[PDB]
Amino acid sequence: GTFLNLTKPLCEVSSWHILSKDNAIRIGEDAHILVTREPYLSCDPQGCRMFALSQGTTLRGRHANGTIHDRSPFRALISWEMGQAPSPYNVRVECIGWSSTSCHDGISRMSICMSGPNNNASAVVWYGGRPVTEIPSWAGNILRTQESECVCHKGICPVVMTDGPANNRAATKIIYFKEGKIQKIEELAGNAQHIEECSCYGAVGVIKCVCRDNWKGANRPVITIDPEMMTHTSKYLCSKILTDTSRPNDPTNGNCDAPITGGSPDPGVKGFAFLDGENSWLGRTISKDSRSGYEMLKVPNAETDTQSGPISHQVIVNNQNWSGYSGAFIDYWANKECFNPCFYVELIRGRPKESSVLWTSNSIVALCGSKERLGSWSWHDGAEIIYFK
Amino acid sequence: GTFLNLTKPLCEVSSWHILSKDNAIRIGEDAHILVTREPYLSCDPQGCRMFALSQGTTLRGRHANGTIHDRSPFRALISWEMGQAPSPYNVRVECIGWSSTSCHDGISRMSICMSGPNNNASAVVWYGGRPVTEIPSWAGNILRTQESECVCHKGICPVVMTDGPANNRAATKIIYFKEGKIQKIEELAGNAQHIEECSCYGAVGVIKCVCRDNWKGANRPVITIDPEMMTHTSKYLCSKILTDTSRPNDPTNGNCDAPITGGSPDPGVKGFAFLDGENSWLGRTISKDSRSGYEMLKVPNAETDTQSGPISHQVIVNNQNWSGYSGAFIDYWANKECFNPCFYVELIRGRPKESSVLWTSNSIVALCGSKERLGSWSWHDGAEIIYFK
Amino acid sequence: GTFLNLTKPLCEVSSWHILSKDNAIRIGEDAHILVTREPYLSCDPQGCRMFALSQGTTLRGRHANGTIHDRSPFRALISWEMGQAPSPYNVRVECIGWSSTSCHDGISRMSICMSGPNNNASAVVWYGGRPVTEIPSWAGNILRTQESECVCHKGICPVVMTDGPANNRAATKIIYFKEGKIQKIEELAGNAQHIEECSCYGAVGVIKCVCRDNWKGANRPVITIDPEMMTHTSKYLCSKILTDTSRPNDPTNGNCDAPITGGSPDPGVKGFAFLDGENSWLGRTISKDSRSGYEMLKVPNAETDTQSGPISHQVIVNNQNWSGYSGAFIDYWANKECFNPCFYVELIRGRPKESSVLWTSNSIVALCGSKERLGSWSWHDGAEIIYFK
Amino acid sequence: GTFLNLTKPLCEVSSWHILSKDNAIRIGEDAHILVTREPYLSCDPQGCRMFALSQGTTLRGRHANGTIHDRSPFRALISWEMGQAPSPYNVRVECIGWSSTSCHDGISRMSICMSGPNNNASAVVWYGGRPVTEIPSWAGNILRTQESECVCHKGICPVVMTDGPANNRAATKIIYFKEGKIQKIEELAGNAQHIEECSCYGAVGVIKCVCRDNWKGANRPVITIDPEMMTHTSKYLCSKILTDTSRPNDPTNGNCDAPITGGSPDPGVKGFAFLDGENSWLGRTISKDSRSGYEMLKVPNAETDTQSGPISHQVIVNNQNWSGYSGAFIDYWANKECFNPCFYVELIRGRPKESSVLWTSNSIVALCGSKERLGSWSWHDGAEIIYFK
Ligand SMILES: *[C@@H]1O[C@H](CO)[C@@H](O[C@@H]2O[C@H](CO)[C@@H](O[C@@H]3O[C@H](CO[C@H]4O[C@H](CO[C@H]5O[C@H](CO)[C@@H](O)[C@H](O)[C@@H]5O)[C@@H](O)[C@H](O[C@H]5O[C@H](CO)[C@@H](O)[C@H](O)[C@@H]5O)[C@@H]4O)[C@@H](O)[C@H](O)[C@@H]3O)[C@H](O)[C@H]2NC(C)=O)[C@H](O)[C@H]1NC(C)=O
Ligand SMILES: *[C@@H]1O[C@H](CO)[C@@H](O[C@@H]2O[C@H](CO)[C@@H](O[C@@H]3O[C@H](CO[C@H]4O[C@H](CO[C@H]5O[C@H](CO)[C@@H](O)[C@H](O)[C@@H]5O)[C@@H](O)[C@H](O[C@H]5O[C@H](CO)[C@@H](O)[C@H](O)[C@@H]5O)[C@@H]4O)[C@@H](O)[C@H](O)[C@@H]3O)[C@H](O)[C@H]2NC(C)=O)[C@H](O)[C@H]1NC(C)=O
Ligand SMILES: *[C@@H]1O[C@H](CO)[C@@H](O[C@@H]2O[C@H](CO)[C@@H](O[C@@H]3O[C@H](CO[C@H]4O[C@H](CO[C@H]5O[C@H](CO)[C@@H](O)[C@H](O)[C@@H]5O)[C@@H](O)[C@H](O[C@H]5O[C@H](CO)[C@@H](O)[C@H](O)[C@@H]5O)[C@@H]4O)[C@@H](O)[C@H](O)[C@@H]3O)[C@H](O)[C@H]2NC(C)=O)[C@H](O)[C@H]1NC(C)=O
Ligand SMILES: *[C@@H]1O[C@H](CO)[C@@H](O[C@@H]2O[C@H](CO)[C@@H](O[C@@H]3O[C@H](CO[C@H]4O[C@H](CO[C@H]5O[C@H](CO)[C@@H](O)[C@H](O)[C@@H]5O)[C@@H](O)[C@H](O[C@H]5O[C@H](CO)[C@@H](O)[C@H](O)[C@@H]5O)[C@@H]4O)[C@@H](O)[C@H](O)[C@@H]3O)[C@H](O)[C@H]2NC(C)=O)[C@H](O)[C@H]1NC(C)=O
Ligand SMILES: *[C@@H]1O[C@H](CO)[C@@H](O[C@@H]2O[C@H](CO)[C@@H](O[C@@H]3O[C@H](CO)[C@@H](O)[C@H](O)[C@@H]3O)[C@H](O)[C@H]2NC(C)=O)[C@H](O)[C@H]1NC(C)=O
Ligand SMILES: *[C@@H]1O[C@H](CO)[C@@H](O[C@@H]2O[C@H](CO)[C@@H](O[C@@H]3O[C@H](CO)[C@@H](O)[C@H](O)[C@@H]3O)[C@H](O)[C@H]2NC(C)=O)[C@H](O)[C@H]1NC(C)=O
Ligand SMILES: *[C@@H]1O[C@H](CO)[C@@H](O[C@@H]2O[C@H](CO)[C@@H](O[C@@H]3O[C@H](CO)[C@@H](O)[C@H](O)[C@@H]3O)[C@H](O)[C@H]2NC(C)=O)[C@H](O)[C@H]1NC(C)=O
Ligand SMILES: *[C@@H]1O[C@H](CO)[C@@H](O[C@@H]2O[C@H](CO)[C@@H](O[C@@H]3O[C@H](CO)[C@@H](O)[C@H](O)[C@@H]3O)[C@H](O)[C@H]2NC(C)=O)[C@H](O)[C@H]1NC(C)=O
Ligand SMILES: [Ca+2]
Ligand SMILES: [Ca+2]
Ligand SMILES: [Ca+2]
Ligand SMILES: [Ca+2]
C-alpha cells in the first residue's frame, strides 16, 4: 500500500444512484441482527465497508429493550462487508465505545472510539487493528466525535472532536493523526459556534466537514481543513436552504457568519453536504421538524451565496418514512479520474418516534453521484413495525 | 488474471450430471435463509458461485409475506458459494435492484442491477466490486435484463437489455461493455419480435442467447452475437419442439422467422438452449401450461430444422413438482479442451401456485453435460409446504 | 504443492489421544446444524477437515423427519473446519449425492459422489473443486463407495467402488485416478466375497483397506493395493477377534481365506483397522449385536495370525452409548518422520435405535495414535434425547 | 515469521484503557452463542484473539443445563476473532479438553488441552494446528494448566502444569516447549506451596507468572522463569495487599516466603499481577469473600515490599456485579518500543451465584495499559438474568 493523496477533483454530480442497502430491520425481524445506530461507510483500497455503533444485543433479543439510550459499556464500533446486515457472526469489532470515527490512510485503517462515564470519557485510537494512542476528556462532558468517516492525505488524518455541553459553548479540537499518533492539536477556530458530528470528504488537497450546531443554528457549520499545513477555518453554510433538523422555514437569505435560530423541537441531527461551487448538493430531512424523509438538493454556490436555492432535487426517502443521521464518504481508491461523492442515510426505527416497541435501531441506505439524470424512488427502511409487536 | 477468450468448441453432450443443489427451502424452514427468486450461476477463474435476487427478508420471517411481488427497494443481487443456501451471513451483495446479470471477464466480475420505479428505472454497472457506469431508462417502462450470466470475450461482455411493455413491442438493446464501460450500443435487430431474460453462452468466438418472447411466440427467440465485431442477428428457434411456457402442443413444423402463438395462461418463462448442430439440447417445463416439471431434449439441428424432434431425453424435475426459470452458464475456466454446457433450474415454491403460504421463494439445482449416458432422477425442491403452515 | 508420496512407515501406537469432537447433536438442539450421517475426516497440506453426507435439512427442522432414509436428491458431501459442527453457514459442498469418498493428492482434492435412482446411479468425480469425470452404474444396483477418505501416492488415488446387491455377490472395482481422471480399472480380485465401505490408509508405498462384507462374513475383508503398479489383492482379517457388527462370539481361530458367518441381526457396519505386524490395532463396536460402544484392541499380527488376541485395549465409547460407522485417516502432511494412524467414530443418534424422535443424525469423535500410554474415557455423543422431545 | 524474542521492557502504566468486550451473555440470550468459561486472550503477529473452554452447547440450548460442572468430554479450547462473541459458526477448535493454555512463538501457535478422567488425564500439545506431543498424568489427579496464555522467547515456551490434590500438596512442573516438543522438564522449586492457573507475561528476557495457591495462601504465588537457561524460582507476592479470593482483610505486613491463610469460603480464583518495581499493578476482586467486582491497584514494589500499598486505583467491574477469573496477556507484536501490559476479566453469570438459572457461562472484558490518566467506568457483563427465566 501507499498513503492516499487527495490529488483528484470532485466528480460532477447530476443525480444519485443506489450503492448499497442492508435492509437490516426487515431481516433482523427473524435473523440474528445486532441493534445499532449511528452508521456510516468507509472504504479502503480493497473495497467499502459498513460501520455502526452496536448496542451489544440482537434486535429480537430481550436486551434490545432500552436501546434508545446512547451511552453504555455494551456499545462498540463494528464494521462489516457492504450490503450485508450486521450480525454477531459477520462483524469486525473496531474499538469499544459509544462515539466513533474511522478512515483508511491508504496503508492501514485508523479507528477511534470514545467510552466511559459522561464526566470522564476517553478516546482510544486504533491503527492497523491495534490500539496506539489514548486521549482523556479535556472538558469533562462526553468527549465525542464524528460518527462518520475521517479523511486522510499523505498519511495525515484530521479528526474533529468535541467535549463539553450539547446545549451551550463546548470545547472542540481538530486532532491531526499519522499512524494513529498525534502530530498536532488545534482548538476550533472560525465562526462556528458549536460543532457536533462532522461529515467530511476531501478533494484537491482540501478536506471539508459539514457539521451539526446543536446549540444555536439551523444552518450547518462548515469546517475547511488543510491537511498539509494542518490548519483550518470554520463558518456556516451560506445558503438560505437550511439543512439541520429541526429548522424554521427557509428564509429569503441565509447567513455565512452566524447561526440562524428557530425550529422545534429537535436541537439537531448529523448531516452533510458536498460543496464545490456550482457542483454543490445539500442533504436534509424532508420534515423541518422531525427526522422523517430525506432529500438531496442541488444548490449552486451554497457555500458563498446567501440567496442560493435548489435547481434540482432528488427524494431519497419519502416523507412518510423515518430517516435519521446522514453523512459523507468517498471511495478514494476507485478507478476514476475524479473522487465521486457518496452519502448514506440512517433509517431509524423504534423509539422515540415508534414507541410501541421497546428498542431503537436502524438500517442503512447509501448512494453515490452520477453524471446521468437518473430516475429515483424512495429507499425507506421497509420493515413493518407491527411484525415486531 | 487475463481476459477470457472464447477459443474452445462446445463439449459434446449425451446426458446431464448433477453439479449442485442448495435445498434452500428445506433448510430455510428452520435456518436463516433469504427469500430469493430469479437465481443463476456464474463462474470465475477460482470457481463457480450461485446468484439470485434477494427479497431482503428471511423465508420464515414475517416480511416474507408479499414476496410474490417482483420489484421493491428491498431487493438486491446476491452471490454465494456454490451449493450453500443463501443466508444473511454468507452472501455477497453484488448490486442493488430487481433485475440483474453478471459475468467475469477473466480478470474481474461485472455485475449489473436495475432499480427504481417502473417509469424511471436505471441500471448500475459494477466492475471489480465498484460501480463504474449508470444507464437511465430509455423507454420509461421497467428497464430490465437477463436474470442469468452474461459472457465475455477478449474483455468485451455483451448484455441484452429491454425497456418497454411486457405485452407489446418494446425497445431492446445490446450493450457491449469492457471493464463495465460502454464500448458500443446496438438496437435489437433481426426477426425476434420481443426479447426478455436472455440465457447466453459462448464458444469459438460466438455468443448465443436464447430468450423469452413475452408478447407473441411460444418458440424462443435466439440472438447470435459476435463480440469482436460487436454485431448481432436474431431469429426464432426453428424446431417444432416449442420451449416457452405457456405453449400449444408442438406442431408438425416450427418457424425460424416468426412467433408461433398459442398456449394459455402464462405469457412466458425464462429458458435456454444449447445450439450446436447435432449437439443441440432444448430445456423446457414438462407442462405446456404451467411452470411444472423440467425436461432436457436432444433435438439435433434445432437451430435450422423446422421438423427437428427429440432423439433423447432426460427428466430433470418430474411433472409432479414445481420448476421455474432456467438458464445457461459455463465454467469457461475448467481444465477441459472444450467448454461444457451447464444449466440451472429455479425451483419455485409458494405463490401463486401454492397460495396456502404468504411467500414466494425458490431453491436451485444445476447440472452439466456428460459424454456418458448417465442415469437420472428428479431433482425437485424437496420441501413439504405443510411444514410451513 | 507437490504430489504426496507414501514414503514414510506407520507410527508405532500404544494408545489413542483425542484429536477432535464436534458435539454436533448437543449444539444442534438449539443452533442451525445440518442433519448428517456417514462422516469422516480427510487432511491436506494446510490441515484436516470433517466430511459427511448432509441430508439437506437442519436437525431441529421439520424436514429432519424421515432422515433414517439413506438415499434422496437432497443429500450432498459437505466438508467443514475440523472441530466445528456442520451448519448451513460453514460447510463447503464437495459434490451432490448419497455415497462418497474424498482425498487430497498433495496438490488438489478429489471428491466423488454417487447419486440417482437405485437402478441407474452415477458417480461424479471432482478435482480441485470442478467436476472432471462421470461414471455410470455398471450393475444397476446402487453404485456406491467408501464413505471415508481415499489415499494418494505419486498422483495416483485408488478408490474402491461397489455396484450390485447388498445381500449377495456384487461387482466391486478398484478405480485408479489421477487428477480425477481414470488411469486404470480393475475388477475386484482375491478372496473377499463382498466389499462395502472400505476404510483405507497408506505407508511405505502400500495402501491397505479394511472393509465390510455385508453378505457373509463377520470378519472384515482386507484389500491391499500397490498404487504404483496399480494392482491389488484381497483376503479376510485373519484374527479370531471379529470386528464387523453383528458378529458371533469370537471363535478360537479366525479365517484369512473365507467369511466367518453368524451374528444377528445387523448384516454389517463400516469399520477399520491398522495392520502393521505387531503394531496392529482393530476397532469394533463393544456390542456384538448392535452399533453400541467402541473399543480399540491391539492385536499383534492380526493380519496373519488366526489365533491372535488383544494384548491391550482402549474404550473409545462406552457400551451404554451409541456408536456407528468408523474409518481411518492420516495427516500425511504432518511434521513427523512417520505417518500416524487416526480414526473417527460416528456417533449415531435417533432412528432406528432411538425411535422416539423422527430423525437420524450423528456427531463425530476422532483420535490419533500416541506412543505414550495415555489414560482414556468415553467420548460419547453427549446429547440428551429427551431434550429433543 | 521469526521467533519472538522478549527484548523489550514493560511499558509504564498509569491507568487502563478498554481493549475489547464481547457482551456474549447479552447477545447469547437470543443468538447462537456457545456456553464457555475460563476465557483469555492471546495475540500473534496478525492480531489478538479471544480463547475459552467451550461446554459444547449454546447458552439458550437445553444442554446448557448442568454447565456448572468443570470437566466433561464435551469441552474444547476454542478461539475467535477478538470482540466477537463465541458462536458455533465463528470459532476455531484449538484442541479438545477441560484445561488449556496457548501461545504464539512468532512463527506458529502452540495450544495445549488436558482431557480424560480425573485419575488418568492427559495433555495433547498442538503446534501449527497439528498435534505433536502427548503427556500422561504423572500424579493421577486432574492434570491441568494455566487457563491463560503462555509466553515464548527465542522459540522456547514454558508452561506451568499441576497434577495432584486441589486442597493439599500437588506435583507442579514447568515444561519447556519448542515447536510443541519438550526440551526440558523441571519440578516446581521455590517457596510456593501450591500452584494453580498461572497468569504469565514476559519482558527483557524474563517470564513472570502470578498464580493461585488453592491450598493455603491468600497471597498469590509468583514464579519467575528464565526461558534461555530454562530455570525458575518461586515465592509469594510480598505486598500486604492480598489478591486471591477468598482472603482475609489486608494485614499490616504481607509475606514473601509463606502463605497467609484465612478468608472464607472460596479456596481461590485465577488472577494476575504485573510486577515491575514502581510500575507494579495488582488485580483482585473487590469482595474479599466472593468473585464480585474487580479493581486494579498500583502498588509500587509489591514484589519486594511487605508493607507496600496502593498509590492509585481503577475500578474495572463494580462490586454490584459478578467477576471471575482474570489473567495477563501482551500483544508482543505491537508497533511499540515497550511491551504493554493487558489483562482480561471473566464475567461469570449463572451458577452458583445465580442459581435461578440452570447454566454457568461468562462474557469477557479486556483492557491494556495507558501512560495517560484515563477516566473509568464499570465494564460489567450487562445481561439481565430475568430475561433468561
Ligand atoms: C425521472 O427521474 C428524474 C430524476 O429523478 C426526474 O427528474 C426530476 O424532474 C423534476 C421535474 O422536472 C425536477 O424538479 C425540479 O426541481 C427543482 C428544485 O425543486 C426543489 O426545491 C424547490 C424549492 O425549495 C425551496 O423553496 C420552497 C418554496 O418555494 C420551500 O418549500 C423549500 O423548503 C425550499 O426553500 C422545492 O419547491 C421542491 O419541492 C418539491 O420536491 C420536494 C422534495 O425535494 C417535495 O417534498 C415537494 O413537495 C416538491 O415536490 C424541491 O425540493 C424545482 O425548482 C423545479 O420547479 C422542478 O420541480 C428535478 O430536479 C429532477 N431531478 C433530477 C435529479 O434531475 C424526473 O421527474 C423523473 N421522471 C418522472 C416521469 O418521474
Ligand atoms: C438409465 O438412464 C438413462 C439416461 O437417463 C436412460 O436412458 C434413456 O432411455 C430412454 C429409453 O430408451 C430414452 O428414451 C427415448 O427418448 C426419445 C425422446 O423422447 C422424448 O421426446 C419424445 C417426443 O416428444 C415429441 O413428440 C411427442 C408426441 O409424440 C410430444 O408429446 C412431445 O411434446 C414432443 O413434441 C417424447 O414422446 C418423450 O416423452 C417421454 O418423456 C417425457 C419426458 O421428457 C415424459 O414426460 C413422457 O411421458 C414420455 O415418458 C420424450 O420427451 C424417444 O423418441 C424414444 O422413443 C425413447 O423414449 C432416453 O432418451 C434415454 N436418455 C438418455 C439421456 O440417454 C435409461 O432409460 C435408464 N435406464 C433405466 C432402466 O431407467
Ligand atoms: C490409565 O489409562 C491406561 C490406558 O487407557 C490404562 O491402561 C490399561 O490398563 C488395563 C489394565 O492393565 C489394560 O487392560 C488389559 O487389556 C488386555 C486386553 O483386554 C482386552 O481384550 C480382552 C480379551 O478379549 C477377547 O477375549 C474375551 C474373552 O476372554 C472376549 O470377551 C473378547 O470378545 C475377545 O475375544 C478382553 O477380555 C478385555 O475386555 C475388557 O475390556 C473391554 C473393552 O475393550 C470391556 O468391554 C470388558 O468388560 C473388559 O473390561 C479387553 O477388550 C487384557 O488381556 C488384560 O488382562 C488387561 O485387562 C489395558 O490394555 C491398558 N490400556 C492401554 C492402552 O494401555 C489404565 O488402566 C488406566 N489407569 C486407571 C487407574 O484407570
Ligand atoms: C477521572 O478518572 C480518573 C482515573 O480513573 C480518576 O482518577 C482517580 O482519582 C482518585 C481520587 O484522586 C484516585 O483515588 C486514590 O486512590 C488511592 C488508592 O486507593 C485504593 O487503595 C486504598 C487503600 O486500600 C487499602 O487499605 C484499605 C483501608 O485503608 C483497605 O480497605 C484495602 O483493602 C487496602 O488494604 C483504598 O482505600 C481505595 O478504596 C477505594 O476504591 C475502592 C476500589 O478500588 C473502593 O471499593 C473503595 O470503596 C474506595 O472507594 C482504593 O482501592 C487512595 O490512596 C487515594 O486516597 C485516592 O482515593 C485514583 O487513584 C485515580 N485513578 C487513577 C487511575 O488515576 C478520577 O477520580 C476521575 N474523575 C472523576 C471526577 O471521577
Ligand atoms: C423493558 O425495560 C424496562 C425498564 O427497565 C422494564 O420496566 C421496568 O420493570 C421493572 C420490573 O417490573 C420495574 O421495577 C419496579 O419498579 C418499582 C418502582 O418503580 C419497584 O417498586 C419494584 O420493586 C420494581 O423494582 C420498573 O419500574 C420498570 N420501569 C419502567 C420504566 O417501566 C420493562 O419491564 C422491560 N420490558 C420487557 C418486556 O422486558
Ligand atoms: C400479509 O400481508 C397482507 C397484505 O398487507 C396483510 O393483509 C392486510 O392486513 C391489513 C391489516 O389488517 C388490512 O388492512 C385493512 O384494510 C382495510 C381496507 O381494505 C381497512 O379498512 C383497515 O383499516 C385496514 O387498513 C388489509 O386489507 C389486508 N390486505 C389483504 C390483501 O388482505 C396480512 O395481514 C399479512 N399477513 C400476515 C400473517 O402477516
Ligand atoms: C413425519 O413424516 C411422516 C411420514 O411422512 C408423517 O406421517 C404421515 O402423515 C401423513 C399425513 O397425515 C399420513 O398421510 C395419510 O395417509 C393415509 C393413508 O395411509 C391417507 O388416507 C391420508 O389421506 C393421508 O395421506 C401418512 O400415513 C403418515 N405416514 C406414517 C408412516 O405415519 C408424519 O406426520 C411426520 N411427522 C411430523 C411431526 O411432521
Ligand atoms: C436439568 O438437569 C437436571 C439434572 O439432570 C434435571 O433434573 C433431574 O431430572 C431427572 C428426570 O426427572 C430426575 O431423575 C429422576 O431421579 C429419581 C431419583 O432421584 C428417579 O426416581 C427417577 O426415575 C428419575 O430418574 C433427577 O432426579 C433430576 N435431578 C435433579 C438434581 O433434580 C432437570 O430436569 C434438568 N432441567 C431441565 C429444565 O432440563
Ligand atoms: Ca441545530
Ligand atoms: Ca411466450
Ligand atoms: Ca458382515
Ligand atoms: Ca488461595
Short mmCIF file of C-alpha atoms in Angstrom, two decimals, chain A residues 17-21 23 25-27 29-33 43-48 60 81-85 87-90 331 333-336 340 368-389, chain B residues 31-32 34 54-67 71-76 87-98 113 115-124 126 128-137 179:
data_model
loop_
_atom_site.label_atom_id
_atom_site.label_comp_id
_atom_site.label_asym_id
_atom_site.label_seq_id
_atom_site.Cartn_x
_atom_site.Cartn_y
_atom_site.Cartn_z
CA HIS A 17 -27.50 6.17 -7.92
CA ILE A 18 -28.07 3.35 -5.44
CA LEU A 19 -24.85 1.96 -3.95
CA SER A 20 -26.00 -0.27 -1.10
CA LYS A 21 -28.90 -1.05 1.23
CA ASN A 23 -32.44 -3.98 4.95
CA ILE A 25 -34.54 -4.29 10.28
CA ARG A 26 -36.56 -6.39 7.80
CA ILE A 27 -34.00 -9.17 8.00
CA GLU A 29 -37.15 -9.45 12.48
CA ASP A 30 -36.18 -13.14 12.12
CA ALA A 31 -32.40 -13.43 11.87
CA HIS A 32 -29.68 -12.64 14.37
CA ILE A 33 -29.00 -8.99 13.63
CA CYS A 43 -13.66 2.47 2.02
CA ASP A 44 -10.11 1.18 1.65
CA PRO A 45 -8.03 0.01 -1.34
CA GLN A 46 -9.91 -3.34 -1.38
CA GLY A 47 -13.48 -2.11 -1.09
CA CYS A 48 -16.05 -0.38 1.08
CA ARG A 60 -35.23 -9.56 18.60
CA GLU A 81 -18.99 -6.20 4.36
CA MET A 82 -21.00 -3.56 2.50
CA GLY A 83 -24.58 -4.67 1.86
CA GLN A 84 -24.84 -7.42 4.45
CA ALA A 85 -26.78 -6.66 7.62
CA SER A 87 -24.86 -9.88 12.79
CA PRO A 88 -22.83 -11.26 15.72
CA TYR A 89 -21.35 -13.64 13.14
CA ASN A 90 -20.09 -11.26 10.44
CA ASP A 331 -14.25 5.60 -2.41
CA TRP A 333 -9.48 4.21 -4.40
CA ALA A 334 -11.97 3.95 -7.25
CA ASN A 335 -10.72 3.62 -10.82
CA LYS A 336 -11.92 7.11 -11.72
CA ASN A 340 -17.13 10.68 -6.56
CA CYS A 368 -23.23 7.87 -4.97
CA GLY A 369 -23.14 10.59 -7.61
CA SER A 370 -23.95 10.09 -11.26
CA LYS A 371 -23.39 12.48 -14.16
CA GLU A 372 -26.51 10.97 -15.72
CA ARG A 373 -30.02 12.15 -14.95
CA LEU A 374 -31.29 9.01 -13.24
CA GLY A 375 -34.82 8.33 -12.09
CA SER A 376 -35.41 7.86 -8.40
CA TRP A 377 -37.62 6.23 -5.79
CA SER A 378 -37.78 6.08 -2.01
CA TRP A 379 -35.26 3.78 -0.32
CA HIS A 380 -37.04 3.63 3.03
CA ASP A 381 -36.31 1.01 5.69
CA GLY A 382 -39.15 -1.26 4.61
CA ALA A 383 -39.93 -3.07 7.85
CA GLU A 384 -43.43 -3.35 9.25
CA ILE A 385 -43.32 -2.31 12.90
CA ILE A 386 -46.47 -4.41 13.53
CA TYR A 387 -44.43 -7.55 12.81
CA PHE A 388 -42.30 -6.67 15.87
CA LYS A 389 -45.33 -6.47 18.15
CA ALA B 31 -32.44 -21.77 9.40
CA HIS B 32 -31.92 -18.14 8.44
CA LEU B 34 -33.04 -15.31 2.47
CA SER B 54 -32.85 -11.40 -2.64
CA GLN B 55 -36.15 -10.04 -1.32
CA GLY B 56 -34.45 -8.56 1.75
CA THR B 57 -36.06 -10.88 4.30
CA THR B 58 -35.61 -14.44 5.55
CA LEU B 59 -38.02 -17.18 4.46
CA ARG B 60 -39.53 -17.78 7.92
CA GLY B 61 -39.56 -14.05 8.64
CA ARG B 62 -42.81 -12.11 8.69
CA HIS B 63 -41.55 -9.92 5.85
CA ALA B 64 -41.65 -12.96 3.53
CA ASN B 65 -45.36 -12.12 3.33
CA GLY B 66 -45.89 -10.45 -0.04
CA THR B 67 -42.73 -11.65 -1.79
CA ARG B 71 -39.99 -5.09 -7.73
CA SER B 72 -39.23 -3.38 -4.41
CA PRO B 73 -36.47 -1.22 -2.88
CA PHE B 74 -35.57 -4.22 -0.72
CA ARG B 75 -34.19 -6.47 -3.46
CA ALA B 76 -30.52 -6.96 -4.35
CA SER B 87 -28.29 -16.64 4.21
CA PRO B 88 -27.81 -13.11 5.58
CA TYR B 89 -24.47 -14.43 6.87
CA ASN B 90 -22.88 -15.88 3.73
CA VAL B 91 -23.93 -13.69 0.80
CA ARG B 92 -22.03 -11.05 -1.13
CA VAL B 93 -24.21 -8.13 -2.22
CA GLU B 94 -23.25 -7.54 -5.86
CA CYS B 95 -25.57 -4.58 -6.53
CA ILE B 96 -29.00 -3.27 -5.51
CA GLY B 97 -32.12 -3.80 -7.60
CA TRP B 98 -34.76 -6.11 -9.05
CA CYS B 113 -28.68 -4.29 -11.38
CA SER B 115 -33.73 -0.47 -9.71
CA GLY B 116 -36.29 2.29 -9.32
CA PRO B 117 -39.92 2.95 -10.22
CA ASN B 118 -41.44 1.41 -13.36
CA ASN B 119 -41.39 4.68 -15.29
CA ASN B 120 -37.87 5.76 -14.33
CA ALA B 121 -35.65 2.75 -13.63
CA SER B 122 -31.88 2.80 -14.02
CA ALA B 123 -29.06 0.29 -14.30
CA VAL B 124 -25.88 0.50 -12.27
CA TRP B 126 -20.31 -2.66 -11.29
CA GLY B 128 -14.38 -5.38 -9.62
CA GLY B 129 -16.85 -4.65 -6.84
CA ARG B 130 -17.15 -0.93 -7.60
CA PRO B 131 -19.83 0.99 -9.54
CA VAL B 132 -18.48 2.31 -12.86
CA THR B 133 -21.40 3.16 -15.18
CA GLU B 134 -25.04 4.21 -14.80
CA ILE B 135 -27.71 3.89 -17.51
CA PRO B 136 -31.10 5.61 -17.35
CA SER B 137 -34.28 4.02 -18.72
CA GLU B 179 -14.39 -3.09 -17.60
#
